[PDB]
Design a protein around this nucleic acid. Structure first.
Lengths: 117, 103, 109, 53, 141
RNA sequence: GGGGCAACCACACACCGAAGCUGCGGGUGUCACGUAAGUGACGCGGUAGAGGAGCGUUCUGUAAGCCUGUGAAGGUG
RNA sequence: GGGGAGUGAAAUAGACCUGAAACCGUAUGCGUACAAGCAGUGGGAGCCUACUUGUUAGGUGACUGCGUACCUUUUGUAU
């Protein structure tokens, strides 16, 4: 029973060249280059799921820091001010209140100053 | 009217009407949910924050559906060492809707 | 619109791209004047095709020879005839001999 | 010497961007209504309205 | 999801700095903070939000200790043996406005944003600026 | 490492900082449970290499069946 | 060599069933002429065409953070 492998080879090639479209020049059309650029673009997508969490945390912090100097503190004395008391608020929703809801942020900052920390 | 409720180990910015996606919780479709883990309640300008939890305030929500959003890929490759391993993932979620805020 | 072809024409593709880009999107009155006075080999062949596309418009489909503006000129590649040519120290190398397909398509709009 | 890597579709097409054509010397004969090249004898043999051949 | 600034909705201002005895690199660190936009709550890194600066006395600036008769400013011309140097004191009589620009230029990113943040800096060696039409406000005398 | 002046010793609080730990949601090996998964009950980087469990291709049985000119195999979305 | 017209169930079955990939073109959309590198990935402005008209989807990707291909030999290779 001779089997000829010309039809199940083709389905596995088109499955690679579908994930690798949108690429420059010869990385999106010939297979011995488009197999390397599919594996490499899967390692980057694995590392950058962790680095996504670090690029926003560093963006939330630098927005609280700018907004809390305009009222009269730093960032680092504010976080000790909220944790002298118990307010229990993330960085994600402080940096929303810094931009959009600016009057509610000032009513938070005055309570850290009353906490005197 | 905006609250800060804490659903699944993380908190949100809810202002009513809210087609809002939450991680999966154990309730059927079409049932009402009360969130008793609200942290600050604002109204107009009248805004109060909870020493840890603000008292009395509730948010009423109900479940629109269940689903499973994505298909993310995982490739664990080592160059030059004869090792490669793949795996798929799709995460559950639960879309709810806030008909809520109670000061 | 009406068309014309010359499938099998000895000049290569790349040499004859340089005469197609000169006339794409003009009127056929001055298209016959660019090709009467050009000095290239492809120009004597493309004018033979451009007046074949016109005479299919005075004939079969009605149209006058004035309102025609040449719409779509493209030149494709055809069969290549493969030949050998000897070089020095016993080694012989291979020559191709190319051709092309030309398609001039005038439109009465 | 030979190359070390091959040239892509971009760097091959950029080279031949300076290689276009031109033919601009056309002129109409005042008398016979025949088209020819400026400062040349017309193909019926008229130069500035005079038969020469 | 978290808010990002939009380049067609950005609001920018006009500040004027007097440098009349300010230490060079302690002055220049507060210009470069306010050109980038770390003083605004709506700061995203990939857009430029920051205030135009006008510096009016770029020849009164002060450096500390023995550094006036030192501190060579090296740069290379491209040709062989073309290294060139000029100290702090001889430079300030030639072009006073290029002391305080090269100190700020090295405290910025090296991007095509850094080249765009650098165009909001405008120094003068005089005592008055040709920007009365924009009416800059004073800061931090 | 560069701009530049944020240098050294004693000392105090605060913050920052990993795929570490915790929270929430899924999965799986093992052993018990609460019937060894009805359910529990505790772990998971990996080369050479040892062990466990699967997909697909061609031909034969089931196949004088079943599907198809209202449209097969293929090719392409 | 074509453009018709006729035969045929069908001439993109025309001297030839199907007719893929590399390679070469022609149209339509969006981005690129002061900007430095395994050419991707995370965030992301704008524009376009569709749908109820915008997360209803698709296509481009200015800007920006991290990022020195694959195999084989080896105490180690971006080498």
């Amino acid at each position: 029973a001779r089997v000829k492998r010309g039809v199940i080879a083709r389905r596995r090639h088109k499955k690679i060249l579908k994930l690798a479209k949108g690429y420059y020049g010869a990385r999106s059309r010939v297979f011995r280059v488009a197999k390397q650029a599919v594996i490499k673009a899967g390692q980057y997508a694995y590392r950058d799921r962790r680095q996504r969490k670090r690029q926003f945390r560093a963006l939330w912090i630098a927005r609280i820091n700018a907004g809390a100097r305009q009222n009269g503190l730093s960032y680092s004395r504010l976080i000790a001010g909220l944790k002298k008391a118990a307010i229990e608020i993330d960085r994600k929703v402080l940096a929303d209140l810094a931009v959009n809801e600016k009057a509610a942020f000032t009513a938070i900052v005055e309570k850290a100053k009353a906490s005197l920390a | 009217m905006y609250a800060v409720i804490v659903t699944g180990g993380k908190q949100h910015k809810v202002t009513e009407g809210e087609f809002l996606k939450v991680e999966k919780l154990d309730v059927a479709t079409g049932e009402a949910i009360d969130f008793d883990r609200v942290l600050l309640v604002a109204n107009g300008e009248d805004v109060k924050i909870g020493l840890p939890v603000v008292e009395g305030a509730k948010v009423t929500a109900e479940v629109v559906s269940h689903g499973r959003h994505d298909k993310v890929r995982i490739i664990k490759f080592r160059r030059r060492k004869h090792h490669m391993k793949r795996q798929g993932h799709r995460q559950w979620f639960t879309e709810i809707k806030i008909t809520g805020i109670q000061a | 619109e009406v068309a014309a072809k010359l499938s099998g024409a000895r000049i290569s593709a790349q040499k004859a791209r340089l005469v197609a880009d000169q006339i794409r999107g003009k009127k056929v009155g001055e298209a016959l004047n660019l090709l009467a006075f050009s000095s290239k080999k492809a120009a004597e062949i493309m004018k033979k095709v451009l007046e074949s596309a016109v005479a299919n418009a005075e004939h079969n489909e009605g149209a006058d020879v004035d309102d025609l503006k040449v719409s779509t000129v493209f030149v494709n590649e055809g069969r290549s005839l493969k030949r050998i040519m000897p070089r020095a120290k016993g080694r012989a190398d291979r020559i191709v001999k190319r051709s092309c397909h030309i398609t001039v398509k005038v439109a009465d709009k | 010497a030979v190359q070390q890597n091959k040239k892509s579709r971009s760097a091959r097409d950029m080279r031949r961007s300076h290689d276009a054509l031109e033919s601009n010397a056309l002129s109409v004969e005042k008398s016979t209504g025949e088209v020819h090249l400026r400062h040349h004898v017309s193909p019926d043999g008229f130069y500035r309205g005079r038969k020469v051949v | 999801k978290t808010y990002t600034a939009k380049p067609e909705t950005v609001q920018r201002d006009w500040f004027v700095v007097d440098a009349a005895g300010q230490t060079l690199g302690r002055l220049a660190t507060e210009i470069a903070r306010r050109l980038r936009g770390k003083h605004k709550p709506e700061y995203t890194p990939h857009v430029d939000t920051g205030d135009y600066i006008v510096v009016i006395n770029a020849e009164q600036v002060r450096v500390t200790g023995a550094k006036t008769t030192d501190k060579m400013y090296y740069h290379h011309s491209g040709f062989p043996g073309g290294i060139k140097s000029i100290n702090f004191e001889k430079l300030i009589a030639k072009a006073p406005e290029r002391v305080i620009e090269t100190a700020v230029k090295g405290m910025l990113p090296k991007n095509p944003l850094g080249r765009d943040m650098y165009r909001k800096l405008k120094v003068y060696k005089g005592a008055s600026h040709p920007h009365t039409a924009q009416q800059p406000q004073e800061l931090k005398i």
